[PDB]
Amino acid sequence: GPISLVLRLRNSKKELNDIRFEFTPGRDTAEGVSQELISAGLVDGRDLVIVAANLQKIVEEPQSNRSVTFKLASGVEGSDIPDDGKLIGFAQLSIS
C-alpha cells in the first residue's frame, strides 16, 4: 500500500457510481474505512459487516484479489430482486 480502490454500487436513484478511495495498510482498517463509507452516506449501515469483510479480502492480497463482488444486506428484499450482473443488491470492490 497505499492501495487505490474503487467501490462500485448503485446510488439511491439506482444509478451506477464508482467511488474512488485510498487504503493505507498499517494505518487504516477495513472496519474503520467501512464506517467512513457509512457515515459519508455512501453505504447503507446494514452493509457494515459484508463491506468490511470484502474490504479486508481485497486489501490483504491486492495482488490476488483484483475484484470482489458481494451481496448487500440492504438489498436482500428491497423491491428489486438482487442481480449480481447488474449490481442490484450487490456491490463490487476493485483495485484501480
Binding site: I19, V33, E36
Partner: peptide
C-alpha cells in the same frame, strides 16, 4: 476527503 464519487 477520503472518497470521490
Amino acid at each position: 476527503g477520503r472518497f470521490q464519487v
